[PDB]
Structure formats: structure tokens, C-alpha cells
């Protein structure tokens, strides 16, 4: 959607994912967190767990 | 931005033709013309303010006879308007020619819709930038609006041009179905004063009408206009005070 | 993919005409029209709902007879419908001229579609911006949907326009093949209510139908729309309570 | 950019035609012309003061006899004038061919505009960036300006070309509708004198008129012109000392 | 690529006309049409499922009659399918008009390819976005595939559309010329099983075939389909145990 | 870059539409031709210097017979010249076919201007990039310039091409209306001299005249041009000392 | 390169048409076709090689008959060949209409290269993108390559296609003007087998030939290729070990 | 340059037509053809140089018979030249039909230049990228060169093609104006020898000529080339060592 | 119909929008907006509250 812009944002995103269930636990989290779209979200965070 | 308005043939993903919407926005930079339909006639009002002391007082003067009981006013390109008016006349005389039948208002409006839709669809040309108000009494009074595209819409009172938006609101409040000729003549004048934001004098309007009884086109004269002006201007003043 | 969408002589590299995809979105910026097929005939209903009371909804038409046993409804530009139904009328009648036979529903659907394909070959003409639902009885009821692309598909219940999605989910549950005339009519009305999201008023809906038994087209006045609209509206209330 | 202005069959997002608005300015790029209507005829005055001693004093011309009793001036591009006036003249004699009727001033300009409407709609051809002023006496004097678009405006006094803006201002205070033929003739010249910013010499400016007693095109040779010019030149002096 | 594909006229550095090969992608999306030749006739099997179950999917229909021994199935636009088939129909009956011979399988294919091709070389018009297989027995089985390009490739078994991929890879192992009438009809039905990835119902499928010993196109009713469908359903399921 | 000189169907905002002023720049680059008007005729002079000894010293032509009383000379492309000069010769004769009147220089001029403007106005064809000088004596000597725009400009004496500005200055000072045929001829040979910044030898120039007392075109013979040149060279040399 | 290949009208700066260049690549993508002309006739051989056993025994058709003693074979786009060849047959019939003589190969070739030339001139229609080798025996054997450009070139042994380069190199050594009828046709099989990089069998080559001594075109059965193929394999083998 | 070279319709502010010049860069890709005009006849010498030993020397020629006493050469596209020159045959023919006078070489050149000229003006079709040398003798020899514009230039010694610049230099130096048919023939063999940069064999060249006394076209046999060629080779070797 | 520059504006814009409602009932953060007209502003900033 913009050459520097998706990839910069995609990096912040793919970090956030590691802690969520990449190798690393919940840690009693309990997330919770809002959006207004579902189309812009990676399939990777979208699935359960 | 895109090139869906770089052609007349090319649809946008939104579903639209912006090229037509910019033929819409060719209408709006022409001055106000208003049509009011009553249960006794239909009364067609058009600005004649546009001009100068320099110019004639009867500078365009929009309310051209199309048939002896059909008049048609304009807003948009006064160029684009004249050919459609002259075509309008030719289509009305064809109806008489081929049937010896007074031209139905609805059917003439159909024929105008067909005429512009050829110019809409075809891309080695552009559609007309003008909206006409088609009005006459076949044996019931009618007012229609024809669009740049050639879209037929039925109205019982409407305006086209810059004055459209102010007047739409005005009729929603005041317009009623119990209305009459005399009452309509005053209402439509009030609504023309809103559009220009200033008071009426008998010479800065033309008003045409097709009565149901006479069933003839008649112009209101400046002398007849003066008393309708006195009555109209009463409400003009009120709605232009804050 | 970008720029394979500003001609109609142009396929995209993904295979699909996106030009046509944008011509099917003009239908959806129109007003819904639903058709439902019963054994006793074929019923065609259309949203005559209008956004204001300065227009007169009754006269603004929506749904036109085409042949004496075929009727048709439009969704999209008023404008493109005018060229297309004038095409239709002339074609339906041209069959009667050289065969003396009232045109078959498939066959008219086909000839309108061949017209619409021809405006989709040449880049020199803008493809149509409407869809028709073609419903008559030839010898058996048929209920087609013509597509702006100039394709025809047989359906037994269908819609066109903005309500297309909702009427599909509705008739997915409640459509039966064993419906009677009175039941089909009711079901179609209920469905139109979902699409506008509100009750029906007799005065802003038009229904026309062609029976198999009679093979004559007849048009439902507001007076006779009344019995059906009470029964439909109770169901709409319940369904849109959820 | 901006425009949406490389095609005439594409409207700007304002809804305007850049192409025509641009072609309006080519009238202005060319030489001035001053038309003035009075109540004892109509005078058209055309600027033929241009270039150095390398050119002849006659420089064509710029004030063509259109009909016996109708004349026109031109401002703008000469090439475009040459063909426009050709059609104008042929149409003036065509009315007499089919009606044996001296063409009305009014109708002649309406059809000069109608030709030009065609070259504004159809993208297969340029707009003519030229404006004629049309002066004659059908049986009352009338003065029109025809426009590149094909818009049509009745004046009673005007300027076009280089002096278009300047002379509008000259005439707010000075011009009345109670002037004599002679007064008018002198006043159209003061204004012309205003435009080039210099004393006028009648040996390179061409004046014609149609009176109401005459009903014939006549042309004023420089010997005759001398006293008119002498009453203009005092005033041109008064102006250029303030 | 780019720029060698947003017109019909353009050649690419490869020599290919990517525009035409992108209308072969228009075919490619929706749906299987299968042709299978044998030495005891030719059998043409085609898809006939269309959308959900509101859609009547027991008609519309790929296997169009074109002569008394000529039939073609379609894959691609439905819009293009009607006109191309209609032309095909015209050309068949021209041979009867003028030679009092039903036309040969070869010549009809030859012709209708040339027709698509004429339209390839013209610009401002596109080739048809549909592909047919031309099945017939003149006195000999033939099976052709006529391309949206307007080229001719004779096959002894092929498929177009979505299922093209499956049926090719299947026919590498299976196809032989030792097939009879029966073995081919069941074997192409298995071929189609693999293509939509499901078991067959004789409701959603349609078969026409042209036999040497009748010299007729015949269109197989669903009761008649059903025996052959039983034979095939066991094969298709063993092959979807991969 | 400008984007207002892609086609002639575009205009500039400046009013000086660039693509026909680029047809003007085509003229300038071309090599010189001068028209010099006296009271005893008109004299017309044009380059024949072109090429070295590969090229003919008898290269035909730049000095065209159009009539046996009208000559023409050119600058710009001799290709564009060729077709135009052809049309000139037929047109002139066409006046003769339908009147049996010698076409006057003024009337001939207006017709070539009209021809030029056909090509100028249409956007599917470019203007001729050539200018024309038309010299005759109908019974009064006359000289015009016709622009590649097909615009008409009258001169006392004029030149075009590379040497336009030098001659322009030359006749600015010296040119009078009291020059005799001898005086004006030698004066224009001086001016041609300057244009090519060199002497004149009788093979670098072709010179023709239309006389008053014969009103017929005659071309001055090579050795007959030699004494005018002989006196001219004296002067050309005085000024190229500077 | 860029912008000189978006139509056939445009030339690039070197004077090359890049559109036309892409048309030779069009020849080269397609299958090899070789012609070898000898004193006793002219033999034309074209690759019948198929990438599947699901294509016909003879795929229709690689080598056309186009007159009594005139044949051509194709390489490049085989879609265009159908139209090209439809025309080539007609032109050769035509000369038999109007002088009732067998057309000579040269004049037939001229006329087909005019038909290309026609689509080369116009920028509306894209040119032929297929090359044919038209071969026949008139007064003596003649052989041409007619190129997409609309050019003819005569050769004494030739090639076009994929194999084009390989068979130019081969004949440069091996071809000579001392070759018999049989030694030549056999030499083309050797040429063809290198080209595909495989031993030849009758089902992957198509041969016709032209005899002097019969003065008629014949098309050689797969059966009567069998001896020549056998003779050919030895040389091909040696060549594929080199 | 940059869009002002990508259509033929355009101009540049240089005032060039870059498209025409590119069409002239086409003339310079092809091979040299050289003509000399002497008082006792006209000489035409064409390149016949073959790219290969498999190319047939008979046609790759430039020289075309046109009239009994007119031949011509071409440089440019092959395709363009044969169509263009078949037009010059026709034109020569028309003249003979309607006046019964064989076409002069000068008139022919004006006619075929004007034919190229409709294709240069028009936007819908490209000009030819050809120059001709039109050589004949009418009463006394004539030699003209046609430009790709359609410009017409008279010459006495001229070239077109690739070898042209050196041939221009060559005829400056070497050619004399007292030379005979025989002596100027040899000199043109030295000039062809220069351009191809080897000592000619008389089987890579072709000579045609027209003498005044014979008043015919002849074509020089290989037998009859040799004395000119042997004489030439002696002076050609000297320029390739010095 | 998209544009590339707009994608930037919008991911910024929503964070403007977010804070404005955001001040907890603890602390009083009042704001005064200004704009050229509502004719250039989206529905979502024209939103009540
Ligand atoms: Mg929040």
C-alpha cells in the first residue's frame, strides 16, 4: 500500500507476535485490544492462541 | 487522481461516472431556475437577473416556448441548452406531425432522455451539461427534471442550478398538496428571492405558465408581475433577516 | 493490476474484466428489485422508494411492461434503462412482426443481452449501467436476470441492486419450489422490507405480474397492494426485531 | 495539470470546460472591437490599427457584411473568423431561399452559436477561439455577442477583444439608453481610443452601421469619419491626463 | 510485461499478443467443458452447475445445437458465448442456403476461427473472450478446439476452463483410441469428476454427442445420463483417494 | 512541457495555441521568399540557391503559376507546398468554370485560407506547415500573406522564412508607394541579397511579375534577370561591408 | 523501445519500427518451416511436431494448398495464418478469374505483401505477424519468403522459424545448385531433424512438394515419407554426435 | 522528442516534424541507389548485394520499370516501395489513358509526391519512409529525388541510402559536365564500388538506363555489365588503398 | 479510489481522534479545534462527542 510504509509497520507487528505465542507464553495476558477492521490484520495473529 | 474521469466511457469501482458528475457540476454554475406545480397549472420561473445595466433586461430569458403548452427553462451552458431546446421543439412537432396529437409532457421528456443518452454513452463526444425543466399541461399539469445523463425524474416542485439546495428545503416546509395557482405563484417567487439572496423587482424574472383551463402557454407581463412581487417579497425579507 | 480497467477492449492479466465489475456496481448504487417465481405465474416487485416528498413516487417508474405477457424491472441509471427498455419494446414487437408470435422470455433476455455484448466489444461506446430482471410467461414462467455484461441466467428467485445480498440470504432459507401465488407474493414483499430495512407502504412499492393461467400481465394498484402489505409487514417487524 | 483540458469531451472537476475557458481568452489575445446600440440604429466599430508601415492600412477588415442589413465584427483568431463568417453568410441567404424572409439578427447569431456547439461537443475537431459581434436592424436594432462555447448574450453596449474589461467600466458611468446615433457613434470611439491608449486616426479603423431608417448596411469612409473622430479626440485626451 | 498488453495492437519482445492470451485467461476462470473423441463418434460433456440453488442449474447450459450434427460447448463469458454461437449458427445455415449441404466440422471451425481473428486484427474492438470446442461427425468423428485468438487446433480429447489442468494430466495416462462410444462417454464423465473435485449428479451436467451411425447431434436427458454417471462415480472416488 | 501542442484540438491558456504557431516555426526555418508591390505591377522573388552542384541550378520551383495572372511563392515545407499549390491551381480554375471571371487576388486568397483551415480545425490531421504569398494584379495590385494557420494578413510589401527580419527592416526605411517597376524590382533584389548574406547570381533566384498594363504573369528569363542583379549587387556589397 | 511500439505508425530514431521488430520474434517463437528449391521442382516441408498425443494425427494444417501448383507453409502466429491464407487462396483464384491464367508465385506474393502493407499503413489495424514460404513452379521453380513487414525475398533454399538460424548455417555448407529432386527433399529432412534435435518419424513432419514434370502440387502421404525418413536418420545421427 | 515525435500529427517547437525525419532515418538504413543525369541519357545504378549465398540475386533489387521511358529506384522499406511504386505505374497509366501522351518525368514526380503527402498530413495512417529517384527522359533527360515528406527536389547527380554521404562527396569532386553516357556510367560503378567498399562483381549490381535516342528503358545483362565493371575496379582499388 | 499519500494521513489521523475522547474523568483536558471548513473534513472528525 506504500513501499516504505507497510514494511516499517510490518516490522513493529512481527515483533509483537513473538511474545504472543511465538515461543513465548501468555504470562497471564489477557489481551484484549481493539480494532475496527479485520482485513488489514495478518492471518498469523488472526488465528486462535 | 485517477483516470475514470479522463474518459466518459469508464466506470469507477464506486459504481459511478464522475464525468457525468462533473456535467452535474456544469449545471450548478449556471444560475437558478425553479419550476412549481400546482393543482390548477404549472408555473415555471427562471432568473433574468444575470447581465448588467449595459446588457438587455431580456437577456436570457430562459423560458423558451417548445410547444404552445410546453415551456422549458434551463440552468447550465446556455450553449448546450439551445440545441436541446431546439431539439425539444422538433420532437414536439414530430408528435403533432405523425399523430396530430398534442405532445404529452411525459413522452417529450422521454425523447429528451433518449437524445442525451446517446451523447452519454458515446465517447467520441460528451453529454450535455444542462438540466432542463420540462413542463406543460397534456390534460394534467406536469413538471419533470431531465439530467445530463438523460434521467427522468418527476417533481411537483423543484429547482436546478445553484439555487437548488436552498429551495428543496423551502418546499419541504411550505409546499403542500392543497395548493393552488395563485398561492403557487406567490410561493415560487419567494423561493426565487432565496436563491439570489436579495429582493425581486418585476423585470429580473420571467415567469411562464400553462394553465389547465386555457391549456396555452402565457407569459406573465411585468405589469402583472408587480403585485405577485409585493406579496412574495414579504417572506423574502423574513428569511433573509437572521 | 492497475490500468487494466480504463478500457473495455482490455482484459486484465488476472483474466477478469474489471471494467464489467465496475458496471455491475452501478446497478448496486440503484434501488433493489426482486423477482420470485411461483407455479401459478411470476411476480415482479420493485423499490419505488424515493428519498423525498417533492418527487411523486407513483409516477417514477421502475417496472414497465415490455410485451403483453412480459414485464421487466430495472436497477441502475434511469438513463440507461430508457435506451434499454425502448430497445426491448421494439425487439419484443419485432418478433410479433415477422412471426406473429409474442416474444419468449428466454429469447427477449437473449436479444437484450446480445445488445449489451455489442456495447462491450467496442471501446467506442460505454457498456450499459443497468440490469433488467425479465419476468413473463411464455408457455411456462421464466424469470431471468440480465447482467450489464450482456449475460443471462435463469433463476427462480433473484434480486438486482443494493439488496441483492440480503434477498439471497433470505430466499436461501425460505424459498420453496412448491409456493402458491399468494404465498410467493408475500414472500417477495417481506424480502424487499429487509433490503430497505423498514416497513412497506403501498404508495412506494410497485408490483406487476404475469400468470401462466391467464397469460396477461396486470399491474397492482396501491388499493390492491394493501391486503398483501399488512401480512408482509408483520413478518418484517418480527424478523428485524432480531 | 490542472485539467483535464487536453480533451474537450472531458469536463474539469469544477464541472467547467477548461478547453473552452481557455479558448475564450484567445479572443482577448486578438484585437479589440467595440459594439454599441443606440435607439436610432446600431454601430459596430472594429480595430484595424495594427502593425508598422510594412503593412497596408487596409488590414482585412475587421467588419464583414454578413447580410444586406446585418454585419459582424471579429476579434480573435483570423483563421477561425474566415470559416465562421462563411457559414454565417450562407445561412443568411438560406433563410431567404426557404422563406424569402430577411433573416432576423437574433436568429442568425443563434445559428452562428449552433455551429459552434457542434465543435464544442465533438472531440474530433478544435473549438473556434473567435467571437463575432452581430449588429443589425431586423426592424428594431439588436446587438449580440456570439461566444466560442456557443453562449449567446444580448447587449445594448459592449466591448470584446483587448478592451473587453476596460470598456465595460467606461460605459457604467458614461453609456445611457437615451443616446442619439451621433452621440453613440462618438462614444464607442472614445472607448476605442481608451483601449489602445492613443489618439485615433480614421485612416486605419473601420466603422459600419445599420440604421432603422435605412435597414441597410453602410460603411463610413475616412472623409466622413473626420468630425466624429474630432469630437472623440478631445475626450481621449481628457482621459489620458488623469 | 506492461504496455504491451494494455492494447490489442501492441506486440511484445516475445512476439505474443498478451491481450488475446488474457482473454484466454477469461475462459480459464469458469468452468470445465470437455471434449472426447472416440472411433464410434464424439461425445461433448460440459458443466451446467451455476451458483447456488435459487439459480436453476438444469438449464444455462453450454451444449448448444448448431446444426443437425454440429454442437459446441462454451467456457468463458456468457455474453460472448451468445453472439459467437449465433454467428456460428448463421454460417452453418449459409452452407445449406448455398450448397444444400450441411457444413463439415472442419469448415465450421475454420470459419468461426477466422471470424474471431478478423476482430483480433481490428483495434478499438477486441476478440471474443470465449472458447468453444467444435464437436461433430460429418461422416467422420472430429473434435476441435477453437481459440479466442482465432486459431484452430484439432485434438482427439481436450478441455477448456477451470478443469483444463486436471483433464490433460489424466488423459496422459488414460486416453486411447480403442475407446468406443460407451467407454468414452463414461471416461470423459470421470475426467470432469476430477475437474470439479466431486462426484457427479446428472442434474448439474449435460452431454450432447454426435454419433457416426446416426449423424445426429442428440442431447442426453438426465434419466439417460444417470446409468453412465453410476459407472463413473466409482472411478472418480477411487481417484480422490489420493 | 507544455501539453497544449500535443494535438491542435488543445488550446493554450495564453490564447496563442502553440501547435499552429509551431506550424509557423516550420515556415521560418525554410528559406526566403519576398513579395514587393508597386503601382506598375507586383514583383515576386524566391530562393533557387538550394544545394550545391549535385542539385540542379534549374530546380523547379518556388515561383508558381497559379493562373496566367496570379503567381504564388512559399516558405515552409515544399512537400506541404506541393499539395497546396495543386489545390490553388484547380480552385482558381473552378472560379473560372462557374463564372468565367478571373479570380481576383483577394478572392483567391480567402479560398486557400479556407482550405488550410480544414486541415487546421481537425485533430485527426495536422496543418500544412507552409505559408504562402499570393501576388497578382486583378486590376489593382494586391499582396497577401496566408499563414499556416490559414489566416489572412495584407501588406504593402512582405517576406517570410529565414530572411524575413532582414527584408522587413530593409523595406521599413526604403519602401514607398511611388516606386516604379524597375525601382521596386532592384530594391527587392537588394533585400534578397541581404537575406542570404551574399551576392545574387541569376540562378539563386527565380523572379516573376504580374504587370498592370498586361495583367499577365511572365517569368523573367535567366539573362534578362542578369541586368537587375548587376545593379543590385553593387548595393548588397555596400551593406555587407557593414 | 519505448513509445515507438505502441502503434505501427511511429518509427524509432534509427528508422526502425520496433513494432515490426517484435513481429520477427513472432516468426521465430513458432515452429520451423524449411524450403529447399531444386531445378526439378520445389519442396516445402514444415514441422508437424506435437507436445501431446492428445492432438490430432495430422493437426490441421501446417501446409496449405493455395493454388493448382502453389502452396505455402507457415511459421509464427498460426491464428493469423487462417486469415492470411484465406486471402492467399482468393488472390490466386482471382487472377484465374480475370486473365484465366495460373497466377505466377511472384505476383501472388506481391499481392499478399500489399494485404500486409494495408495493415501496416493504417494504425487502426495491427499488421500480420506470421511469415509464409510460398513455393510453386511456373516458367521455372520459384520460392519466396514473405515477411511480416510486407517484404518479399527470394532465396534458393530457405528457412523461417525456431530452426531458422540452424538451417541457414546447414545449407550454407550442404545446399548446392547441383541437387536432384530427391537429394534436395531428403536434405530438408536432415535440416528438420537437427532443428528439433530428434530423429524424424512421419507424424512430426509434414511434406508436400511441387514437380515440374507434373506441373502440380501434391501432398505426400505419411506412408510415402517413410523411405526418405529412413535415409535421413543416418545423417541426423552423425550431426547429433557432432 | 518526448511525445512530439510519437505521433505524426504533432509538431515540435523546433518546427521539425520528427516523425518524418525518423521516416527519413528509414531511408538511410537501406542500401544506396545512385543516379546521374547527363545530356545524352539518364543512368540508374542499384545495389543487388545479397546477404547470403542462399539469397537469390534476382529480386532484392531497387530498379522498377514504370513507363516506356521511366525507371526508378527506391530506398526505405521494401514493403512501402513496391506499393508506392505500383501506385506510380498506375499514375503513369492514368495520364496515358486521358491525354494519350506518355507521362513526363516531372509531372509524374509531382503526382507521386502528392500521394505520399496525404499519408504525411493524415494522423490515421503513416507516411512512407521511402525516397525515390525518379529517372526518365521525356524529350531531354530528367532526374528528381522524392523526399519522405513528399518534397520534390530536381538534381543532376544524387543518391539516397546508407552510402549517400560518400556519394555526395564523390560527385563534388569527380563528376564533370562534359561527360558522355559511357564515361559517366563507369564513374557510377566507381561510386557504387566506393559505398559497398569493395571491387564489384557484376552479379551483386544492377543497371537500368534510358537514352534519348532509344527513348527506352533497357536493363543491363551480366554480359553487358562487365566492361563498365572491369574499368571501374581499377579506379575503385586505388581509392581503397589511398 | 485510494491514494498512497492518504494512507499516511489516516494512520496519523486516528490517533488524533483517539486522545480526544481519551481523558479520564480524573483530569480536565479541554481542546479547541480549528479548521478551514467542514467541507474538507471527514465524517469521523465531524462525529458527535
Ligand atoms: Mg478510544
Task: Describe the structure in your own words.
This is part of a larger assembly, with two copies of chain A (49 residues) and seven copies of chain B (242 residues). In chain A, 45% of the residues lie in helices and 0% in strands. Chain A is globular and about 35 Å long. Chain B is α+β, with helices and mostly antiparallel strands. In chain B, 37% of the residues lie in helices and 22% in strands. In chain B, a hairpin with a 5-residue loop joins strand 9 and strand 10. The radius of gyration of chain B is 18 Å and the shape is globular. The site of magnesium ion has 2 residues of chain I, from helix 1.
Give the topology:
The structure is cut from a larger assembly and holds 2 copies of chain A (49 residues) and 7 copies of chain B (242 residues).
Chain A: H1 5-22, H2 43-46
Chain B: H1 18-24, E1 33-38, E2 41-47, E3 64-67, E4 70-75, H2 78-99, H3 105-121, E5 131-137, E6 141-146, E7 152-155, E8 157-160, H4 164-174, H5 181-196, E9 205-211, E10 217-219, H6 222-238
Antiparallel strand pairs in B: 1-2, 1-8, 2-9, 3-4, 4-5, 5-6, 6-7, 9-10
Helix pairs in contact in B: 4-5, 5-6
The complex binds magnesium ion (MG).
Magnesium ion (MG) binds next to α1 of chain I.
Subcellular location (chains A, I): Cytoplasm
Protein name (chains A, I): Proteasome-activating nucleotidase
Family (chains A, I): Belongs to the AAA ATPase family.
Give the tags.
part of a larger assembly; 9 chains; A: 49 residues; mainly alpha; 2 helices; globular; B: 242 residues; alpha+beta; five-stranded antiparallel β-sheet; 10 strands; binds magnesium ion; hydrolase; PAN
Number of strands of chain B: 10
Radius of gyration from the alpha-carbon trace of chain B, in angstroms: 18 Å
What is the terminal separation of chain A in angstroms?
28 Å
Structural class of chain A: mainly alpha
PDB class: hydrolase
Keywords: PAN, Proteasome, AAA-ATPase, Archaea, hydrolase
Entry title: PAN-proteasome in state 4
Chains A, I: Proteasome-activating nucleotidase
Amino acid at each position: 500500500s506504500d513501499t516504505s510504509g507497510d514494511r516499517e509497520v510490518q516490522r513493529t507487528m512481527m515483533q509483537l507476535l513473538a511474545e504472543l505465542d511465538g515461543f513465548d507464553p501468555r504470562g497471564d495476558v489477557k489481551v484484549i485490544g481493539a480494532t475496527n477492521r479485520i482485513d488489514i490484520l495478518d492471518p498469523a495473529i488472526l488465528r486462535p492462541g | 487522481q485517477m483516470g475514470y474521469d479522463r474518459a466518459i466511457t469508464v466506470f469507477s469501482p464506486d459504481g459511478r461516472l464522475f464525468q457525468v458528475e462533473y456535467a452535474r457540476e456544469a449545471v450548478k454554475r449556471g444560475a437558478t431556475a425553479i419550476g412549481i406545480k400546482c393543482k390548477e397549472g404549472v408555473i415555471l420561473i427562471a432568473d433574468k437577473r444575470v447581465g448588467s445595466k449595459l446588457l438587455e433586461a431580456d437577456t436570457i430569458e430562459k423560458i423558451y416556448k417548445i410547444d404552445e403548452h410546453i415551456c422549458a427553462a434551463t440552468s447550465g451552458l446556455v450553449a448546450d441548452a439551445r440545441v436541446l431546446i431546439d431539439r425539444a421543439r422538433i420532437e414536439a412537432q414530430i408528435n403533432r406531425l405523425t399523430y396530430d396529437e398534442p405532445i404529452t409532457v411525459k413522452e417529450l421528456a422521454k425523447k429528451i432522455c433518449d437524445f442525451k443518452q446517446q451523447y452519454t454513452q458515446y465517447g467520441g463526444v460528451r453529454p450535455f451539461g444542462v438540466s432542463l425543466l420540462i413542463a406543460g399541461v397534456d390534460e394534467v399539469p406536469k413538471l419533470y427534471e431531465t439530467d445530463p445523463s438523460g434521467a427522468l425524474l418527476e417533481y411537483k416542485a423543484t429547482a436546478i442550478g445553484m439555487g437548488r439546495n436552498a429551495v428543496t428545503e423551502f418546499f419541504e416546509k411550505e409546499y403542500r398538496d392543497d395548493l393552488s395557482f395563485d398561492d403557487a405563484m406567490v410561493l415560487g417567487l419567494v423561493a426565487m428571492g432565496l436563491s439570489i439572496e436579495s429582493e425581486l423587482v418585476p423585470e429580473n424574472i420571467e415567469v411562464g405558465y400553462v394553465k389547465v383551463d386555457d391549456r396555452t402557454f402565457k407569459e406573465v407581463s411585468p405589469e402583472e408581475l408587480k403585485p405577485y412581487v409585493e406579496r412574495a417579497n414579504e417572506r423574502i425579507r423574513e428569511l433573509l433577516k437572521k
